[PDB]
Each structure stands twice: as structure tokens, then as C-alpha cells.
């Protein structure tokens, strides 16, 4: 163990993959490399470390989703605490497995640096999300180098949920956040220009309104939105009123840039692991789907896991939950 003999890193072997189209940004759409408009449709699964701990990190999970749930995309929420606990080298080795599985099934990955808080002050909602600017840069530097020229890995979601929690974490400042995303994007593009960065707004990735006046000044990006049921709070709960509020905060973005709702979903207020902002009577499902389909918005439901809520499944035999059965039918129909 001489530190001077520690190897320089290696890149994923693209020859190990079957042919797969690259996804790219064109105006306000994604397109495949055949030129056809593309929509990300799929789910989040849990952090790789959580799945490994219960022996659920396996190809059979991806096969279930691709073959039975109609997904074309899986979002991997890589939690900083798990990145550190497994260690970068081991974690990347498991992401490699996901790449191979996904490629074999013809589906795509969104790699999400899964933190919640305010990166400019390095203050977070919970220790599982704890990180630094330095560690965040390093994650993207390592990821972009390793998966250079890998079509399967389509989207780099830079920071899951920006929030200052009522300014208890710092003073939210769009200019500062914009500049930091631009810095990350520049590192990424210096290493791989074929990948799609995904940028989020404040109020837990809900409010993209700042981009009306001050969008990120880089091409080829998309914007994230997390339009959970309780984020908009109209006094009268109907399509028209939710649509208008969604329009104002995030939906407008889809007129100019591609948008991925990288989290959405619900559970009954008296259901399993129910909490604000995910409580709903179920009318939200058809509403958000109708709204997204109208605008051509892409999405990954939270979450295809039986422990973390709101769940899509009740157990590891994949018994569907209320929202699981709903979205499964939606995705299957969209696939046709």
C-alpha cells in the first residue's frame, strides 16, 4: 500500500454494450439519434446501497420494470452518505452493473446526485444528504470521465432538491445557484458533451420561475421539476386551478426547454408513510398525467421500493400500491 502506486481511473468499456441510441436536447424536446422525439418515462428505485443491503440489487429488478411496468428510464438517487459508505470505487462498480442491465433492456438511466438542501452554504435537510461543493464536483468529475460516450446514461441530475428550508440553511439566491450549476456543467462538458445536465430550482426542485428572467446560460440542458400533490395549494382543488399554479412555477419551462418531473407521486393521507407534500385522495394521478401529456413533459415516479414512501409497490414480489397500479397502466399504455 504505497500511495504513489494507486492507479489512475479507467473508463467504462463501451464495447461491452449493445447498440443503443443517444438521447439529446433539441429546443424544448429530447430526441433520439434517429431524430424521433423522445420522452423519459419510468421510475426511481432506491439508493444502490439500500438495495444491496437486502440483496435486491440485481438485473431481475430492471427486467421487472422494463418488461412489466412499461418503463424506458430508471432514476438512480445516489445518496452522498451511501457514496461515502460504499466508497466511490465500489459504488461506480455497481453503477456499471446498472449500465449493462439497462443497455441490455434498451432502457436509460438518470444519474441523480441525491441531496436536499443548499449547496452554496453546504447545509442540508438531513445527514444522509450531507456533501460539500468539493465532493459534489468530484462526483461529477468521476462520473463524467467513467461514462464518457455511454448512451445508456442519458441525464446527469446535478443536485436533486435545492432548498433553504425557509432560509434556515442559508439565504436562497438564484444568481449564486445559477453560477454554481454553470460551473458544474462546464466541468461535465469539458469531459463529455453528449450528456444531458438536468438543473433544478428552489422550494425542493419545485420553483423554476427564476429561469423566466435568468435561465442557466448553457445549451443542451433540461430542467427538473418535483410537482408533488401538495406543492401547489389552490383553495378550490380542480384541474383548472392546479394547472394554472403548475404553469406559473414549473410548467411554463416546457415551452422553451425539455423538462423531466424526476419525482412525482402520492399516497392516501392515511396510507403508508404518508407525509406532506405527498398526501392526496388519488385525483392527483390523472391530473398530473393529463398535464404532463399535454405539455410533453418527461417523468420518473417516486418510488419503486416497498420501504421508502410514497411506494409504488407493497413488497418485493412487486404487488402494486394505489399509485403503483395507476402509473403502471399509464406507462404500459404510453409504451404502446
In angstroms, give the least distance from the CB of 166 to a copy of itself.
6
Can you list the positions of beta strands (E) in the chain? 23-26, 29-32, 37-38, 41-44, 73-78, 108-113, 116-118, 123-124, 153-157, 161-162, 196-199, 222-224, 259-261, 298-301
CA distances from 96 to 14, 113, 114, 236 (A): 11, 16, 18, 47
Residue number, 172 or 287, with CB nearest to Cl ion: 172
Gap between the Cα atoms of 190 and 98, Å rounded: 25
Binding residue (CB under 5 A) for Cl ion from 18, 275, 294, 335:
275
DSSP bridge pairs for 157: 112, 198
Residue number, 145 or 308, with CB nearest to Mg ion: 145
How many C-alpha atoms does 164 have within 13 Å on its Cβ side?
A: 14
Binding residue (CB under 8 A) for a copy of itself from 94, 141, 178, 237:
141
Our finding on whether 179 is near a copy of itself (CB under 8 A) is: no
Can you list the positions of beta strands (E) in 137-191? 153-157, 161-162
Residue 4 binding result from Mg ion, a copy of itself, Cl ion, none, given CB thresholds of 5 to 8 Å by partner type: a copy of itself
Binding residue (CB under 5 A) for Cl ion from 39, 103, 164, 311:
164
Our finding on whether 276 is near Cl ion (CB under 5 A) is: yes
Residue 195 binding result from a copy of itself, Mg ion, Cl ion, none, given CB thresholds of 5 to 8 Å by partner type: Mg ion
Determine contact, residues 188/144, Cβ cutoff 8 Å: yes
Asked if the bond preceding 165 is cis, omega within 30° of 0, the reply is no
Residue 27: which of 18, 15, 35, 17 has the closest Cα? 35
Our finding on whether 276 is near a copy of itself (CB under 8 A) is: no
Q: What are phi and psi of 55, to 5 degrees?
A: 60, 35
Determine contact, residues 111/95, Cβ cutoff 8 Å: yes
In angstroms, give the least distance from the CB of 237 to a copy of itself.
29
Q: What are phi and psi of 179, to 5 degrees?
A: -65, -40
Q: Which stretch binds Cl ion (CB under 5 A): 65-73, 219-227, 269-277, 325-333?
A: 269-277
Contacting Mg ion within 123-182 (CB under 5 A): 150, 153
In angstroms, give the least distance from the CB of 235 to a copy of itself.
27
Our finding on whether 50 is near a copy of itself (CB under 8 A) is: yes
Binding residue (CB under 5 A) for Mg ion from 116, 169, 195, 216:
195
Residue number, 275 or 290, with CB nearest to Cl ion: 275
Our finding on whether 11 is near a copy of itself (CB under 8 A) is: no
Our finding on whether 86 is near Mg ion (CB under 5 A) is: no
Gap between the Cα atoms of 231 and 246, Å rounded: 9
In angstroms, give the least distance from the CB of 270 to a copy of itself.
21
- Is 153 labeled as ligand-binding? yes
Determine contact, residues 149/14, Cβ cutoff 8 Å: yes
- Is 297 labeled as ligand-binding? no
Q: What are phi and psi of 113, to 5 degrees?
A: -80, 100
Gap between the Cα atoms of 124 and 109, Å rounded: 25
Residue 323 binding result from Mg ion, Cl ion, a copy of itself, none, given CB thresholds of 5 to 8 Å by partner type: none
Residue with cell 432560509: 167
Binding-site residue positions for Mg(2+):
150, 153
Contacts to a copy of itself by CB under 8 A: 2-4, 6, 8, 47, 50, 53, 79, 81-82, 85, 121-123, 126-128, 132-134, 137-138, 141, 144-145, 164, 166-171, 183, 186-187, 190-191, 307-308
Contacts to Mg ion by CB under 5 A: 150, 153, 195
Amino acid at each position: 500500500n504505497d500511495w504513489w502506486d494507486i492507479p489512475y481511473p479507467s473508463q467504462f468499456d463501451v464495447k461491452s454494450l449493445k447498440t443503443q441510441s443517444f438521447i439529446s436536447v433539441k429546443g424544448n424536446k429530447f430526441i433520439d439519434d434517429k431524430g424521433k422525439t423522445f420522452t423519459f418515462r419510468g421510475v426511481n428505485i432506491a439508493d444502490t446501497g439500500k438495495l444491496l443491503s437486502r440483496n435486491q440489487w440485481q438485473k431481475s429488478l430492471f427486467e421487472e420494470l422494463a418488461n412489466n411496468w412499461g418503463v424506458n428510464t430508471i432514476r438512480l438517487p445516489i445518496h452522498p452518505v451511501s457514496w461515502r459508505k460504499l466508497g466511490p470505487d465500489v459504488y461506480l462498480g455497481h453503477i456499471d452493473e446498472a449500465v449493462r442491465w439497462a443497455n441490455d433492456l434498451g432502457i436509460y438511466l438518470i444519474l441523480d446526485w441525491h441531496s436536499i438542501g443548499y449547496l452554496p452554504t453546504e447545509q442540508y435537510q438531513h445527514p444522509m444528504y450531507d456533501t460539500t461543493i468539493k465532493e459534489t464536483r468530484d462526483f461529477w468529475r468521476r462520473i463524467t470521465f467513467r461514462y464518457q460516450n455511454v448512451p445508456t446514461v442519458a441525464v446527469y441530475e446535478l443536485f436533486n432538491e435545492p432548498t433553504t428550508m425557509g432560509n434556515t440553511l442559508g439565504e436562497r439566491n438564484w444568481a449564486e445557484w445559477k453560477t454554481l450549476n454553470e460551473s458544474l456543467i462546464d466541468m461535465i462538458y469539458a469531459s463529455d458533451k453528449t450528456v444531458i445536465p438536468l438543473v433544478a430550482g428552489f422550494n425542493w426542485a419545485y420553483d423554476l420561475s427564476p429561469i423566466k428572467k435568468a435561465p442557466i446560460e448553457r445549451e443542451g440542458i433540461a430542467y427538473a421539476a418535483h410537482p408533488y400533490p401538495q406543492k401547489a395549494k389552490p383553495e378550490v382543488k380542480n384541474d383548472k386551478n392546479f394547472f394554472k399554479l403548475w404553469d406559473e412555477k414549473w410548467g411554463f419551462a416546457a415551452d422553451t426547454y425539455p423538462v423531466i418531473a424526476t419525482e412525482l407521486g402520492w399516497v392516501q393521507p392515511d396510507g403508508y408513510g404518508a407525509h406532506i407534500p405527498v398526501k392526496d385522495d388519488g385525483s392527483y394521478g390523472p391530473r398530473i398525467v393529463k398535464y404532463m401529456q399535454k405539455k410533453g413533459v418527461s417523468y420518473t415516479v417516486w418510488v419503486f421500493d416497498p420501504d421508502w414512501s410514497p411506494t409504488m409497490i407493497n413488497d418485493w414480489d412487486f404487488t402494486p400500491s394505489e399509485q403503483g397500479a395507476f402509473f403502471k397502466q399509464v406507462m404500459l399504455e404510453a409504451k404502446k
